[PDB]
Amino acid sequence: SMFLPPPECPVFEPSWEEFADPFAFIHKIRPIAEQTGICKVRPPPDWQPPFACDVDKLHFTPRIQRLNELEAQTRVKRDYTLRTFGEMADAFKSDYFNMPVHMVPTELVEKEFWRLVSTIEEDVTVEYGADIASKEFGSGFPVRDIKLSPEEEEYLDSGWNLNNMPVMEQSVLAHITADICGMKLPWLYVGMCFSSFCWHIEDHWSYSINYLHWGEPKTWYGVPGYAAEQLENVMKKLAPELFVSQPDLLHQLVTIMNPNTLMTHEVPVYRTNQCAGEFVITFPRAYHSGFNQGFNFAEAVNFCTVDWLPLGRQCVEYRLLHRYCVFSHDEMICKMASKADVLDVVVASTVQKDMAIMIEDEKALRETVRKLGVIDSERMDFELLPDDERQCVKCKTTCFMSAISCSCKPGLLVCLHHVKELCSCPPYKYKLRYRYTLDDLYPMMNALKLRAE
Ligand SMILES: Cc1cc(C(=O)N(C)Cc2cccnc2)on1
Ligand SMILES: [Cl-]
Ligand SMILES: [Mn+2]
Ligand SMILES: [Zn+2]
């Protein structure tokens, strides 16, 4: 009645040994956690990264948020210190419930959240912080610089120090030379009571990992990757405004929606309260949303393992939706092949398999455009072009392996799926621009095979 809490997601308590390597651990829990979309990881009891900062010198610009179910919000985008925000946040929650903050049951805040967002006549608005790490506001984890205490240095090189996560050997998003600071740098989140994150999945269907440094809990709802399209069909029915096309990445539209609505619609949903010192991990294409129970401070980062590689290719195939890419998946694959000698051997083996598919698809696409009467061709170093200068005019995909150009439309490109969409000139006026010949590509893949042995 009113709100039935979804079942709890899995909670893992790894030993110091299991905990040692995050990527090995994540791979281990994957068969369980991928069925629920999110999971919680409790670190071993003594793993306690020191959080220290001045609440007066850290400044940030707050976002403002209206709390209405099914209303469109833009996913990314006054001035507080951490202290003045905290004072605002505590007073807000205290006044809302006429209670001291620690006496307000989490179950009640959850019930109340879903009451207030559904109720038209309540116009509750809240504020929050969300920015990537910078000099005005830096990571909650120890970083290198200022003299560090011995305990801080203990955690400098932790796998679970979220600064290190994108640049470890197991991960594939590291050696991406391309500018993608929005998604390989950690984001910092300053929460207050009811401040919420709308239903979404991560760019390129990556994993994410969220650490709550301190404060009151963060409540999560998650849906397994296998159910992503079920969820979207439900959302399209109840809020079609979110699904109209949108000129870029800055304008992705998202919304608050009751998990019970999804569960009625046969979409599996799980929940958890994430407390201070705990991790939440989201898996590829796992929808998630949630809200904060009170004043808190979280840090999160995207990442990609070898398990993710085939999904990353399927994700870019964005093409059907005409959605912008954050980076070129093929460019990343070829960059890794060009570094085959210093790659991890398991990485090498998995990249090799994705590369083989890439090459077979590219062979077929080039044959098709040849049969359309595109004859002239020229090598082109796509990776040198700013991304906005190498998007398919039609489907907006970021080109790297190849594209079609025409002298009559200088600077415009289409991917090889959209040769007919470039201009009205006959095909013999077109040029195939390619990064590599098929003969360049087979030795690159062979280097991976030798490294993988
Ligand atoms: C508005 C708005 C902002 C978001 C969002 O995405 N946030 C705050 C980031 C986040 C926090 C926790 C987990 N995943 C993402 O949604 N609506
Ligand atoms: Cl409301
Ligand atoms: Mn997220
Ligand atoms: Zn295209």
Side-chain angles (χ1 to χ4, degrees), residues 1-76 79-134 137-168 170-453:
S1 60
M2 282 199 124
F3 187 70
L4 298 105
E8 297 288 315
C9 76
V11 185
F12 299 99
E13 306 195 335
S15 66
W16 260 114
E17 281 134 322
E18 313 179 80
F19 192 67
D21 180 26
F23 290 90
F25 182 67
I26 293 175
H27 176 77
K28 184 174 188 163
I29 68 189
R30 182 168 83 82
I32 301 303
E34 83 180 352
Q35 293 302 294
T36 62
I38 65 179
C39 69
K40 189 163 56 175
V41 181
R42 263 197 265 273
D46 51 330
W47 195 87
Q48 245 285 12
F51 188 93
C53 61
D54 191 276
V55 295
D56 295 306
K57 291 174 180 173
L58 295 176
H59 280 251
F60 69 95
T61 288
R63 300 255 290 132
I64 306 187
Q65 186 175 48
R66 304 164 58 188
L67 298 174
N68 303 126
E69 197 175 358
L70 298 187
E71 182 177 272
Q73 300 183 49
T74 78
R75 206 187 140 222
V76 293
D79 194 80
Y80 284 101
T81 66
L82 211 40
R83 183 190 304 268
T84 57
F85 186 91
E87 277 155 7
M88 174 280 295
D90 285 346
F92 170 88
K93 180 177 180 171
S94 179
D95 292 355
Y96 196 94
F97 290 99
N98 188 42
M99 266 183 299
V101 302
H102 272 188
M103 306 202 47
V104 193
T106 54
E107 301 74 23
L108 177 71
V109 179
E110 184 178 50
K111 260 178 58 84
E112 174 57 11
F113 178 80
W114 293 111
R115 191 199 63 89
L116 73 87
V117 302
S118 75
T119 300
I120 322 143
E121 33 276 322
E122 302 260 5
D123 58 323
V124 184
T125 71
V126 291
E127 287 175 295
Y128 64 100
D131 293 318
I132 64 175
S134 77
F137 213 109
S139 180
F141 290 103
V143 294
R144 297 198 187 260
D145 180 345
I146 279 194
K147 178 79 180 177
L148 285 70
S149 58
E151 200 202 357
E152 285 184 298
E153 335 183 35
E154 304 292 344
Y155 295 93
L156 259 180
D157 292 310
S158 181
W160 299 84
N161 182 325
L162 294 195
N163 298 281
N164 302 328
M165 192 78 71
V167 307
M168 298 184 50
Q170 274 113 95
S171 158
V172 315
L173 226 60
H175 25 257
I176 288 189
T177 179
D179 161 72
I180 48 174
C181 317
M183 109 169 281
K184 69 194 308 186
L185 296 184
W187 289 68
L188 307 165
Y189 300 106
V190 184
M192 68 175 281
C193 192
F194 302 136
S195 77
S196 58
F197 45 110
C198 303
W199 287 103
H200 71 283
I201 49 181
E202 306 305 313
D203 293 328
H204 290 253
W205 299 355
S206 62
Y207 293 75
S208 72
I209 184 174
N210 184 295
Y211 184 69
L212 184 55
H213 284 284
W214 53 258
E216 315 200 61
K218 186 187 304 289
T219 291
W220 291 75
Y221 309 99
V223 176
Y226 71 75
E229 293 181 300
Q230 301 173 224
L231 176 143
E232 286 164 356
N233 288 339
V234 173
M235 208 138 317
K236 209 167 315 173
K237 194 59 200 173
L238 295 176
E241 308 76 24
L242 305 185
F243 289 78
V244 308
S245 298
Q246 216 58 198
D248 62 314
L249 291 153
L250 215 31
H251 286 160
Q252 321 153 113
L253 285 188
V254 287
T255 204
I256 300 169
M257 180 188 285
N258 199 308
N260 286 169
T261 296
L262 295 168
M263 296 157 67
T264 287
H265 275 320
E266 292 171 273
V267 178
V269 181
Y270 298 84
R271 75 173 305 288
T272 202
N273 296 314
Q274 170 191 31
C275 303
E278 305 184 321
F279 289 97
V280 170
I281 298 165
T282 71
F283 280 66
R285 221 197 179 170
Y287 271 99
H288 50 284
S289 67
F291 64 87
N292 294 299
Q293 294 269 339
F295 184 33
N296 65 14
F297 180 84
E299 181 163 355
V301 77
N302 292 118
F303 70 94
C304 298
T305 74
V306 292
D307 309 274
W308 163 86
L309 267 182
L311 290 177
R313 178 165 301 282
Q314 184 190 337
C315 182
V316 172
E317 182 184 357
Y318 286 173
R319 170 155 45 79
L320 309 185
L321 272 51
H322 299 194
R323 281 192 38 125
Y324 291 83
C325 299
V326 176
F327 60 91
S328 167
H329 184 91
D330 290 340
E331 182 179 345
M332 162 198 74
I333 293 292
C334 289
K335 167 60 77 167
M336 285 192 282
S338 85
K339 296 282 185 293
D341 55 335
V342 302
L343 283 183
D344 185 79
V345 296
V346 183
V347 174
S349 178
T350 307
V351 175
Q352 185 221 290
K353 303 184 210 305
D354 194 50
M355 192 161 189
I357 285 163
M358 183 185 75
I359 291 172
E360 283 316 283
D361 293 349
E362 183 70 7
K363 186 175 160 190
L365 285 166
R366 281 184 196 185
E367 289 174 5
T368 299
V369 306
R370 177 53 186 95
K371 284 188 178 69
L372 289 178
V374 184
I375 307 176
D376 207 19
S377 67
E378 188 179 347
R379 179 187 300 267
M380 175 156 102
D381 297 327
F382 283 89
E383 75 273 18
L384 299 181
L385 284 168
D387 285 38
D388 69 342
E389 288 185 34
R390 44 162 165 151
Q391 280 139 346
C392 181
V393 144
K394 181 63 164 185
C395 74
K396 311 301 168 175
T397 200
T398 300
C399 295
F400 174 75
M401 285 293 291
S402 46
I404 308 300
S405 64
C406 179
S407 47
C408 72
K409 295 254 187 173
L412 294 187
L413 300 176
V414 294
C415 72
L416 300 209
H417 289 105
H418 296 120
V419 191
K420 315 304 201 331
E421 321 282 349
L422 175 58
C423 65
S424 52
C425 291
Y428 59 82
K429 300 258 280 288
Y430 295 174
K431 281 189 211 165
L432 168 73
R433 305 302 303 246
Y434 59 90
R435 184 56 178 86
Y436 300 109
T437 66
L438 279 154
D439 293 332
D440 299 326
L441 288 165
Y442 288 115
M444 290 168 63
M445 178 161 73
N446 272 326
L448 292 168
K449 182 157 146 284
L450 291 187
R451 177 71 180 175
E453 297 151 21

